Structure formats: C-alpha cells, structure tokens
Amino acid sequence: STYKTPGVYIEEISKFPPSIAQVETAIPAFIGYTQIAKVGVENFHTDADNLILRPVRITSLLEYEQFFGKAINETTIQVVIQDTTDSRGNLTERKASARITSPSPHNLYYSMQAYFANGGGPCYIVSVGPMSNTGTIQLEALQNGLAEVAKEDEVTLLVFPESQSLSDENYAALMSAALEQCANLQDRFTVMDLKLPATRPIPANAIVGASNAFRDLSLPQDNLKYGACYAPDIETIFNYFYQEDAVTIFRSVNGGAEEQDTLTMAGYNPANGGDGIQYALIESAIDQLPLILPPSPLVVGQYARTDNTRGVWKAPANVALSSVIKPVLKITNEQQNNLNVHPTGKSINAIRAFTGKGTLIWGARTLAGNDNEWRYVSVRRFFNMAEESIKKGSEPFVFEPNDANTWTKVKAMIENFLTLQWRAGALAGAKPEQAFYVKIGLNETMTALDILEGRMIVEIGMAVVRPAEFIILKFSHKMQ
Amino acid sequence: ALTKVKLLAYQDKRFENKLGEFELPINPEQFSQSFKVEYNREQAQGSQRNDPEFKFTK
Amino acid sequence: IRTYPPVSFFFEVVFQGENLDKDVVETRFQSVTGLSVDMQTETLKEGGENRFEHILPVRTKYDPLVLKRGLVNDSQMVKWCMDAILNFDIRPMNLLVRLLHIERSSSTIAPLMTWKVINAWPKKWSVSEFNAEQNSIAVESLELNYSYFETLK
Amino acid sequence: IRTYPPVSFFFEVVFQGENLDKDVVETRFQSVTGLSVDMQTETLKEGGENRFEHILPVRTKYDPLVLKRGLVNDSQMVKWCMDAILNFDIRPMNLLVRLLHIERSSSTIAPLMTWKVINAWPKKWSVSEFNAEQNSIAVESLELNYSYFETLK
Amino acid sequence: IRTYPPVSFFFEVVFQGENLDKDVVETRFQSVTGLSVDMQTETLKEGGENRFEHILPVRTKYDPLVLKRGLVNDSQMVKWCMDAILNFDIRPMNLLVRLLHIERSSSTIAPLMTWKVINAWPKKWSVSEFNAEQNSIAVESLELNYSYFETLK
C-alpha cells in the first residue's frame, strides 16, 4: 500500500459493501467496550487505571475502524460432521453444521455494522475500557461513560448495547440513572431491550416470564415518559470473528452419539498436512451461522430513516428492518394483549413477522402508557425537537437589557419558528391562530420584582394530533 | 444476457451427424408459421349441409 | 343552493402503491391535468329519412394523466418508472386525485372531490431545457396511461 | 425534506472520447436539450367489455441531443463530426451530462445530477444566417443520435 | 483560450467562375443563408432487445443557398442565370463564402472562416412586390443548388 511509480494498482479483498446517510435529528450515543481506542498520539487505554473517557464523533464504519479496531475471536465454535454409511462402513453421504455455545458479551462492532446497515447517521462513541477474553462487564465503567456523555449537547438518544449481560439490580440502577439525566437535561430519550432467559432452545412462553420480571424492576415513576422498551432479539446475516485453531470438531455416524475428535480446524488445513476436502466443508459450515443482536441499534437507524422520510411527528412504527433473517421468538395477538396495555403502564413494543412483508416494528408507546398526554413516542420526540430549536434560537438574547424591546424580539422569533412548523404540517389547525400561542409581558407572565433580577418568562401553547390504532370491520348479507 | 437464433446443419436424415452451425448477428423482429388440414367435400343431391371426411394434414 | 363556485389551486395526489402513500414529497406537485373522457361513434344513413341521420355508439377513450414538479434528485417513484422503462418490467398501480377545501363546524382541511384512477403505468418522462442565459427552474414532467377513472361517491 | 427546487442555468457536458475530455473549450456550451424518452403502444379491444380497452406496450423511443455554441474556428470535435459526415466513417462515443451546484461543509463546486449517454454519433450540423443589418453572434448547432441514457446512481 | 465569440455581420461571397471574381458588385450582398447538412437514417428493431433500437445511416442531404440584394439592373451573374433558365443551358461553378475580421500585428482586413461550395447552378430567381403605398427597396433574391461544401483548412 506504499506506491512510488504513478499508475493503477490491483488488490483482492472480501468485505460487505458500505453505506452512509445524512441525518439531522437522530444523533445517538453508544456506550461500551472497544478494541483499540487510539486517537492522534494518545492511547486512551495505555494505562490499566486512569483511563481517558471522552466521546468521539463518527460518521461511517470506516471512521470507526480507523480509531477503535474491529472485534475479538469467539473461542466457542463447534462443528459437527454427520456421516451416513452402510454396515460394512462404506460412506454414502457426508454433511456438516456449525454451532456456538456461549457468545462473547462484547459486541459493539457488530452493533455498529447493523446500525449503519439500517440507515444511521453521525454518532458519538464513548469507550469505557478494552475488550477482554474474560467477558467482565462492570456497572461503574458504564455509569462513568454515562456521566461523561452529559457534556455533549447534540446527543439525542442513549444506547447501551451490552446491557443484557448485566444483572437485574445493576440493570435497574443503570437505567434509572439514564432516565434521571434525561429528565434533568430535558432533551434526550432512552431505548431499552428486554432481558430473555439465556437458554438454548428458548422454552415456550418465555416472553411472559420475561415481561413479568421486567415489570418488577424499581424504576422512578415520574421519569418513565423518557424511554421505551422493545422486544425480542434478532437473527442477522453477519459473520463471527474466530481463530482457526480454536474451533472444535465432532463426528457422528448413522445418527449415533457425537464424539470429540483430536484435531482442530488447524489439523485439517492442507498447509499443515490435513485433509482439504473436509476443511472446505468445515469452512462452508462455519460461514452459515446467524448472528444474534439486541434490537435497539436497528430501532435507532429506523428512527433516522423515518424522520428523513415521513417527519418526526409521525409514529416510528409499521416499518421493515434490513439485513434481518428472523426474530428468535414468535409473539401472537393473545400475548401482545398484555404487552401493549397493562395496569402498570410499562408498555413493551414488539418486533413481529408478517407474511409477504417481513419483520416489522409493531407498537409505538412509551413506558408511561397510561398517561393522557405522553403515551406516544412521536409526541414526545416532536416536543423535544421543538424545545431544543426554540432554545437555540433564543440563546443570542442572553445578557441583553431587560426591557420591552427584547421581549418583542424574542416573541417575534418564537412566532416565526412556530409558523414555519405549522406550514410543514406538524401542527393541527387550518390557521396559525388555531395551532399555537405565545405570550410575554409585565403582570401577564412576569412580575415587577422579577425584572429587578434578570429573568424573562414566556408562555407557549401548541396543538398536536395523535394516531389511530384499531380498525373494526362489520359485515352483513345484502338482500338480492 | 441476450440469446441469438441458431441454425444447425446436419447430414443425416435422423439428425445425428452435425456438420455445422450459423448464428445470426441480429435477431428478427418477427416470423410466421402456417398450418392446414384437408377434407373431402362431396355432397349428395338436394341435401341441406354436409359432414366432410378427413383426408390428411399438410 | 350554491352561490359561489369552487377554486382550482388547492389539490393533492396520492399513490396507493408499493409504499409511496406515506412519502411526503410524493404528494407535492406543481401541476396535474388530463382527466377527461370521450365517446366515439359512427354515422348511419337510412333511406327515405332525409331529416336526420343515426349516430351509433362505438367505444370509450380516455386522456393520459400529466404531472409536473420541480426536479427531485432521489425519488422512489422515478425508480419505479425507470424500472418499467429500462427493463420492460411494469407493475400497474391505483391513484387518488383530490380537490381540497376548508370545512368548519374549529376549521379543518378536508377533501371536497375525489377521483379513483385505476391501473396506471408509465408512459413518458422528460426534463426541461438547460439554458445559460435564463432564470428558470429544472422542471420534470411525467405522463401515465390508465384504464379509467371514477368518482368516490 | 426539500423546500426549494434546483436551478437550470449551471450545467456542463463531458465527452468520454478520443481525447476530448481534457479540452476546455469542448465543455462550454450555450444550450443543451433533447433528454426525453417515450413509450409507444397499441390499442386492443375485447368484445363484451365496453368500459375500457387494453393498451399494450410496443417499443421505446428517444429524442436527439441538441447543443448550441458560439462558433469555434478550430475544433477537434468538429473534425470528428466532419470525418463522419464527409467520409462516411463513424466512431460512436459516450457522453456525460451534468447539472451542478454549490456544496459546503469551505464551499466547493460539485455535480448535482449526472446522466450517461451511450453510443452517440453525428446527425446534423448548422450555422446561423449572416445578415448585414443585425447585431448578432455566429452560432453553431450540433445534433446527435444515441442509443439511450441512464442516471449515474 | 477563447473568451469572446465572433460577429456575424461582416462577410463576403466570391464566384470562382467565368470572370465574375473581379467584378465588385458581384461580391456585395445583403443576406446569405442556407449552409447546413443533414444525415438521413432508418430504424431497425431487433427481437429480444427491448431497451433500444438500431439507427442505421442512409444518405446525406444539403440545403439550398439563398442570396439577397438590392436590384442591380445590369448584372453578368443574372445573364448567366437567365441563360440557364430560358435556354436550358447550365454550366455549374464553384464558390467561396468568407467570414471576415480585423487582424493586427498595423491592422488589416483578413478572412476568418472560409467555405468552398462545389458545383452550384441556378434554382430560383425572384423580385419583391411593387406597392404604391409603402417605402421599400426593390430586392432581388437568388437560390442555388450545389453538391456539397467544405472548410478551407
């Protein structure tokens, strides 16, 4: 890759094609462990203690790879070869299959890959320490990362892709801290996944027990309008990283019990004197493993796409997912009846497959599903967008004389912004006067003493619309 | 991929010994095919209509 | 009993199709025309009747539908059209054409008239001339074939 | 979501050919037009169905491409055209047509839209009238045939 | 590299003929037009290829040459034309058409562009209407056939 003579050069590689996007509103922050984390001449992981914690702004997967590396090897891959033969032992057929027994908990790279595949834009990466083969995930590192992300103003969404390996008490503590700072900053929204039983195969009706376990987490009651929860996990098409000599081989004949061989893949490689036919068979087997991820990074990518295509005031639901094979669990209508509406208000949205359509997001309700104002995700996301833009527009008026002229100036700015928003179709009403109102004045919104200290008070009201969920059809016999 | 019309030339009347092939540089826009059957159309005296007999296919 | 007639400049078009009914830029058009039907007949003369001839109905014909916009550089609709035109692969769709008004009982935007257009598929696509000496907008124009249209009564 | 449409007077043409892509005067044109496609069909009537007829696709047709400049007295392009026309020796080329804009992230000139025009060869060449009593510029006009055009997606 | 295009109103015509190249009044014209060439083709459709058709070259056609002057009552050129027209006796000639400019290195009048027109002979002759109520000049117009034209490179 060092060249000195001008001209054209040829290289042969194998990889997935890239994709990029332009996004204005959905700027998420991902918190987790990384492989490298080296920027400029500073190694953030140079010391085992005294780690440097700071977010970095990334626009593509190539930029991610430039700073953070890719991934680590799995060490738990097994391949079984099934031989069909006769009594004399003559071989009649041979097949192979691959399986993984316990995946590693460190998965930011695959999550970023799925995120960019689904239409994501610019993001912030915060590393909390290096990836390691012990798989230890600590609450304190994640809370330190969450504490550091509080200093970047563009951040809108919070994501913790590794949360499912955390115990229930620590999970509740982390999510409570996230909701608390969302409530304190007034401009962020949290996306969660449901913890499922770590069994293979997953038993019937595991979703009911999982929902019941979720309902019992101690979460702050008045911040539940600042987040949402999705289920279940998803099987996608990406490959695992592995080291050839770490893969274990098993054999079975005519349906009998499996037996562990004395070789690894390194013993079948023809470069070492192995049997290359079975080696090719094993490699083809390994390439067919599906990869299982939590749903949240795909949900964030779909948020970005929906805001670009339909508008932020529309529900981010009834949309198909990309690069997905299948949900791990099948959810029926009788089961979603207790997931969408529940006495506690802790609604859970579902990912479901529909015939001829694929895998869709079904449900657009928050964790405050019984609140007459803040049930729906789109209403809160719209309010957050409007409030932050009004804030940015009003900031240039700080340190101005506290008089009628500045009040007039700020009022005009706010009315102009809300008029532009009404024109786009985001606010209800046939005329601007029916959609919003803005007020400021002495003994109207402010008081005399207030003037003496440096405070301005503006009252703003806005009218929005809400979606329909149920369609009822009625049939009868028409008289001939 | 675009497929082209081919003409295969044989020497055997059972079409087993191939001699050669020719490929068209430009496919035709259309072609036509024609069929016919032959019947006997003699009629009896002072009779209304008839029921013809089959002779052969051309 | 009506005293004032309706206005023509407040209107909308909806594609009941692949997933185009939810895309905002696919409903905004500068001009829509072509909604007219014609009956074609033949003339027969009867001997002895010199006062008039007979007009006999034959068939029905419809005009193509014409849409005009400012150029959109990335459109799913244009992908549908170019898939039909370049790869000879057509998949007809249904459309709605709406004429809108303000109703109040406060006020709201509501449809006033609606036509259903059945089995539309691409006919023509064009873009306006580029000229170094004129102040103009790049305007694209699409023309469609269809089977018939009906009033949504 | 778009609020303002693009402008038509900032554009360019590139000849991907013998060596004409590096010649500055071969990219400067006063006018470019002719970029439109049409589907030609036939009509079939079915007995018993009196509500509509069937429109069946037949073939695809394209318009010629027209370029206009002020007269250049020594042009390699015109040598190519006159070699085709006088000595019946044609060698088709590929072309690019670009619509340009200003992008900034400071600012830069960048392509906004690009079309590929495949297998172009000369059709017509003309020069405007000479008149002793008018203030005018000598303007030359070239018209080209081609196979089809595509969007550089 | 050019910055300004040439002007159309400074031009000349020369008859390389019987002895007309030295006659001053035979070079002064009010208008000259008709210098354009066209290629005529036919269309062929190939079965199985539905993306485009083939355009095949056939022949080449040229426009007649048109000259306009104020009426000259005694002209050798008009004698040549009327000998062709009245006595069916034609003798084709060669012509030059020049576009002129000012060159300086003081200044001088020099040719800028030159076309050779080969085998010209009379086609049409006309004079404008006489009208008792209008201020006008008697204007005569001549139209010629020719084989082809070439650039004097």
Side-chain angles (χ1 to χ4, degrees):
Chain A
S1 295
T2 297
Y3 303 106
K4 293 182 177 179
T5 303
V8 180
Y9 298 89
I10 294 167
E11 299 183 2
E12 294 180 354
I13 60 168
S14 35
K15 68 176 216 180
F16 289 95
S19 36
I20 63 173
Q22 300 287 306
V23 177
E24 208 73 11
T25 307
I27 311 302
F30 297 91
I31 297 168
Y33 293 87
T34 59
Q35 188 182 46
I36 294 175
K38 182 175 181 182
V39 177
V41 78
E42 329 189 29
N43 190 331
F44 298 161
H45 299 171
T46 177
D47 289 345
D49 289 345
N50 300 306
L51 296 178
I52 295 172
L53 305 175
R54 62 194 292 185
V56 178
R57 188 175 184 271
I58 293 298
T59 50
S60 39
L61 190 62
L62 187 61
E63 283 186 342
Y64 180 88
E65 293 171 352
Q66 185 179 347
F67 299 109
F68 298 110
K70 293 177 183 177
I72 63 173
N73 301 324
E74 281 293 347
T75 320
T76 39
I77 297 169
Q78 304 180 338
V79 174
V80 181
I81 299 170
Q82 299 176 314
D83 288 353
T84 301
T85 69
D86 301 359
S87 61
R88 309 299 296 183
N90 300 1
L91 183 70
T92 315
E93 195 173 13
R94 175 174 287 159
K95 293 188 180 184
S97 304
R99 68 191 185 210
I100 183 135
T101 75
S102 156
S104 163
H106 293 158
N107 62 356
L108 279 186
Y109 180 68
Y110 303 120
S111 289
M112 293 306 296
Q113 197 165 43
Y115 167 76
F116 285 112
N118 271 259
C123 43
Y124 287 86
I125 307 299
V126 184
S127 207
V128 302
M131 290 162 76
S132 176
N133 205 97
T134 72
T136 305
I137 293 172
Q138 294 181 308
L139 180 62
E140 291 77 4
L142 296 175
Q143 287 185 338
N144 290 340
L146 180 59
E148 289 301 306
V149 80
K151 293 186 281 193
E152 296 267 303
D153 289 345
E154 331 172 3
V155 171
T156 305
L157 305 166
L158 303 178
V159 183
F160 300 94
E162 298 168 358
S163 288
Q164 286 179 322
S165 64
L166 196 67
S167 84
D168 290 354
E169 303 83 13
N170 293 338
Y171 184 84
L174 176 61
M175 295 314 191
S176 295
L179 289 174
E180 286 179 351
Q181 90 168 16
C182 289
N184 286 337
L185 297 173
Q186 293 279 298
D187 57 353
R188 299 182 179 180
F189 192 82
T190 305
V191 186
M192 293 183 238
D193 303 313
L194 186 68
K195 292 177 64 172
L196 303 178
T199 309
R200 297 292 181 275
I202 319 185
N205 305 323
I207 195 67
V208 176
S211 149
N212 287 342
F214 184 82
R215 299 270 186 265
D216 289 328
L217 300 174
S218 95
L219 306 171
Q221 182 63 46
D222 50 89
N223 296 323
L224 292 172
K225 66 191 176 190
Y226 287 104
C229 179
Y230 295 85
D233 290 347
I234 292 168
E235 294 179 356
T236 76
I237 68 166
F238 298 109
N239 300 318
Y240 286 96
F241 282 70
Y242 66 95
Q243 184 179 309
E244 183 183 348
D245 64 292
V247 175
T248 303
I249 311 300
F250 296 82
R251 288 182 183 273
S252 178
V253 179
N254 288 322
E258 296 175 1
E259 299 177 355
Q260 186 171 321
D261 175 56
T262 59
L263 301 175
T264 64
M265 282 182 75
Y268 288 90
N269 194 316
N272 303 321
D275 185 3
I277 303 167
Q278 291 175 80
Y279 185 77
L281 182 61
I282 292 165
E283 259 189 320
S284 268
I286 291 172
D287 187 283
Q288 301 299 306
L289 276 166
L291 179 73
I292 298 172
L293 299 172
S296 178
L298 308 179
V299 172
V300 171
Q302 290 300 332
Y303 283 2
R305 290 185 68 248
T306 296
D307 315 322
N308 275 342
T309 298
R310 300 179 188 173
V312 75
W313 54 96
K314 299 291 190 180
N318 202 17
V319 289
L321 299 170
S322 323
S323 322
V324 167
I325 297 168
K326 187 182 74 69
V328 300
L329 298 175
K330 186 176 179 180
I331 300 170
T332 65
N333 289 341
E334 273 306 309
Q335 295 173 319
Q336 191 165 6
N337 277 340
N338 289 291
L339 294 172
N340 194 32
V341 179
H342 192 274
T344 64
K346 294 173 178 172
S347 312
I348 300 167
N349 300 306
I351 311 300
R352 290 175 61 172
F354 293 86
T355 175
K357 298 178 181 179
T359 303
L360 311 181
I361 299 171
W362 213 249
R365 195 172 292 204
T366 67
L367 289 171
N370 291 321
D371 193 318
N372 283 332
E373 292 182 354
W374 303 113
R375 271 196 278 270
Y376 297 104
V377 172
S378 54
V379 174
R380 172 145 285 287
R381 288 183 70 226
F382 174 76
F383 268 88
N384 288 346
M385 183 276 292
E387 289 170 359
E388 68 190 350
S389 316
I390 291 293
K391 181 178 178 179
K392 284 182 177 178
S394 36
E395 285 179 353
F397 292 98
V398 178
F399 303 113
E400 292 289 305
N402 211 357
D403 72 357
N405 298 337
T406 310
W407 308 341
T408 320
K409 286 182 201 180
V410 300
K411 176 180 172 179
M413 181 276 294
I414 294 167
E415 293 177 350
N416 286 334
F417 175 82
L418 287 173
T419 300
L420 284 168
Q421 287 298 302
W422 169 78
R423 190 171 75 188
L427 299 176
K431 294 178 73 172
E433 294 85 346
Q434 300 175 311
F436 59 90
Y437 70 88
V438 182
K439 293 181 182 179
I440 167 167
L442 173 64
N443 292 323
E444 301 180 8
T445 71
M446 294 171 292
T447 189
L449 177 57
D450 279 358
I451 300 301
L452 299 178
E453 295 300 358
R455 317 193 263 246
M456 295 181 184
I457 304 168
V458 192
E459 298 181 20
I460 306 166
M462 298 169 67
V464 305
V465 302
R466 292 177 172 82
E469 299 186 45
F470 309 102
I471 303 171
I472 304 166
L473 309 175
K474 298 182 182 179
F475 293 85
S476 77
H477 286 249
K478 184 176 180 179
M479 193 224 100
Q480 186 178 345
Chain B
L2 178 66
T3 315
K4 293 285 172 74
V5 177
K6 289 182 178 181
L7 259 169
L8 313 176
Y10 293 86
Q11 189 172 350
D12 200 9
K13 82 177 181 186
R14 294 185 66 176
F15 287 81
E16 300 181 359
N17 181 18
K18 184 196 279 186
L19 294 179
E21 64 148 277
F22 181 74
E23 185 176 1
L24 261 59
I26 302 163
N27 286 331
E29 182 206 340
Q30 57 183 8
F31 65 90
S32 67
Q33 190 177 3
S34 178
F35 312 81
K36 186 170 180 181
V37 187
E38 293 279 351
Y39 290 91
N40 186 350
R41 301 193 177 202
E42 259 148 30
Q43 227 179 311
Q45 328 209 36
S47 62
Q48 180 180 359
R49 305 182 184 93
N50 189 26
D51 53 353
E53 295 185 341
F54 171 74
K55 289 198 293 192
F56 50 77
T57 302
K58 306 188 82 169
Chain C
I1 297 169
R2 180 169 64 83
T3 306
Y4 295 95
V7 166
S8 93
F9 54 74
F10 196 30
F11 63 93
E12 202 196 349
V13 176
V14 178
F15 289 82
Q16 296 184 304
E18 306 189 347
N19 192 31
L20 299 174
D21 50 307
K22 293 180 178 69
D23 196 347
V24 168
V25 282
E26 304 297 339
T27 43
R28 298 175 177 178
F29 289 88
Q30 189 178 35
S31 183
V32 181
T33 194
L35 202 65
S36 44
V37 60
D38 183 39
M39 183 66 75
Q40 297 181 359
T41 189
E42 53 166 81
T43 299
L44 176 70
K45 180 176 177 66
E46 181 176 0
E49 177 60 81
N50 298 316
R51 198 196 212 101
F52 58 91
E53 40 199 352
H54 298 290
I55 307 300
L56 315 190
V58 177
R59 61 179 179 179
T60 300
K61 184 176 176 182
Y62 288 83
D63 279 347
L65 188 68
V66 182
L67 303 168
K68 292 189 179 181
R69 297 192 299 200
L71 185 70
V72 178
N73 63 345
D74 175 284
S75 323
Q76 299 300 317
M77 175 217 292
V78 176
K79 287 184 172 72
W80 168 77
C81 305
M82 292 305 160
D83 210 277
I85 291 168
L86 285 171
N87 293 299
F88 221 87
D89 179 7
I90 322 179
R91 303 179 301 270
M93 295 196 291
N94 296 327
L95 317 177
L96 298 175
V97 178
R98 292 173 175 166
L99 187 67
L100 308 171
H101 74 124
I102 302 298
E103 219 166 49
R104 56 159 320 112
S105 158
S106 300
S107 298
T108 189
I109 299 166
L112 179 62
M113 282 284 289
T114 303
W115 295 268
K116 302 184 295 188
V117 183
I118 291 164
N119 291 328
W121 52 279
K123 177 184 178 180
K124 183 177 179 182
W125 183 91
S126 295
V127 72
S128 64
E129 177 183 352
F130 300 160
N131 192 317
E133 298 185 1
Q134 298 182 335
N135 288 316
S136 318
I137 300 169
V139 176
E140 64 173 311
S141 90
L142 179 68
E143 302 190 7
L144 303 171
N145 292 307
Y146 61 91
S147 286
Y148 64 96
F149 66 87
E150 230 197 300
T151 309
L152 185 65
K153 264 152 22 162
Chain D
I1 297 169
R2 180 169 64 83
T3 306
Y4 295 95
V7 166
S8 93
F9 54 74
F10 196 30
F11 63 93
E12 202 196 349
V13 176
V14 178
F15 289 82
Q16 296 184 304
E18 306 189 347
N19 192 31
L20 299 174
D21 50 307
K22 293 180 178 69
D23 196 347
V24 168
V25 282
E26 304 297 339
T27 43
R28 298 175 177 179
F29 289 88
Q30 189 178 35
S31 183
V32 181
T33 194
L35 202 65
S36 44
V37 60
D38 183 39
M39 183 66 75
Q40 297 181 359
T41 189
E42 53 166 81
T43 298
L44 176 70
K45 180 176 177 66
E46 181 176 0
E49 177 60 81
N50 298 316
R51 198 196 212 101
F52 58 91
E53 40 199 352
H54 298 290
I55 307 300
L56 315 190
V58 177
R59 61 179 179 179
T60 300
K61 184 176 176 182
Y62 288 83
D63 279 347
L65 188 68
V66 182
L67 303 168
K68 292 189 179 181
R69 297 192 299 201
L71 185 70
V72 178
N73 63 345
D74 175 284
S75 323
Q76 299 300 317
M77 175 217 292
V78 176
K79 287 184 172 72
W80 168 77
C81 305
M82 292 305 160
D83 210 277
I85 291 168
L86 285 171
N87 294 299
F88 221 87
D89 179 7
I90 322 179
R91 303 179 302 270
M93 295 196 291
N94 296 327
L95 317 177
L96 298 175
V97 178
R98 292 173 175 166
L99 187 67
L100 308 171
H101 74 124
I102 302 298
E103 219 166 49
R104 56 159 320 112
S105 158
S106 300
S107 298
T108 189
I109 299 166
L112 179 62
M113 282 284 289
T114 303
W115 295 268
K116 302 184 295 188
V117 183
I118 291 164
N119 291 328
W121 52 279
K123 177 184 178 180
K124 183 177 179 182
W125 183 91
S126 295
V127 72
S128 64
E129 177 183 352
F130 300 160
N131 192 317
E133 298 185 1
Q134 298 182 335
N135 288 316
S136 318
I137 300 169
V139 176
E140 64 173 311
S141 90
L142 178 68
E143 302 190 7
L144 303 171
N145 292 307
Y146 61 91
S147 286
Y148 64 96
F149 66 87
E150 230 197 300
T151 309
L152 185 65
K153 264 152 22 162
Chain E
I1 297 169
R2 180 169 64 83
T3 306
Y4 295 95
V7 166
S8 93
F9 54 74
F10 196 30
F11 63 93
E12 202 196 349
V13 176
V14 178
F15 289 82
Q16 296 184 304
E18 306 189 347
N19 192 31
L20 299 174
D21 49 307
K22 293 180 178 69
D23 196 346
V24 168
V25 282
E26 304 297 339
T27 43
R28 298 175 177 178
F29 289 88
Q30 189 178 35
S31 183
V32 181
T33 194
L35 202 65
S36 44
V37 60
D38 183 39
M39 183 66 75
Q40 297 181 359
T41 189
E42 53 166 81
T43 299
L44 176 70
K45 180 176 177 66
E46 181 176 0
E49 177 60 81
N50 298 316
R51 198 196 212 101
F52 58 91
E53 40 199 352
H54 298 290
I55 307 300
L56 315 190
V58 177
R59 61 179 179 179
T60 300
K61 184 176 176 182
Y62 288 83
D63 279 347
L65 188 68
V66 182
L67 303 168
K68 292 189 179 181
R69 297 192 299 200
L71 185 70
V72 178
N73 63 345
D74 175 284
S75 323
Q76 300 300 317
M77 175 217 292
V78 176
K79 287 184 172 72
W80 168 77
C81 305
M82 292 305 160
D83 210 277
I85 291 168
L86 285 171
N87 294 299
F88 221 87
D89 179 7
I90 322 179
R91 303 179 301 270
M93 295 196 291
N94 296 327
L95 317 177
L96 298 175
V97 178
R98 292 174 175 166
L99 187 67
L100 308 171
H101 74 124
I102 302 298
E103 219 166 49
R104 56 159 320 112
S105 158
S106 300
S107 298
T108 189
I109 299 166
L112 179 62
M113 282 284 289
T114 303
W115 295 268
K116 302 184 295 188
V117 183
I118 291 164
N119 291 328
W121 52 279
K123 177 184 178 180
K124 183 177 179 182
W125 183 91
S126 295
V127 72
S128 64
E129 177 183 352
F130 300 160
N131 192 317
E133 298 185 1
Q134 298 182 335
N135 288 316
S136 318
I137 300 169
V139 176
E140 64 173 310
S141 90
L142 179 68
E143 302 190 7
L144 303 171
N145 292 307
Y146 61 91
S147 286
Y148 64 96
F149 66 87
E150 230 197 300
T151 309
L152 185 65
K153 264 152 22 162

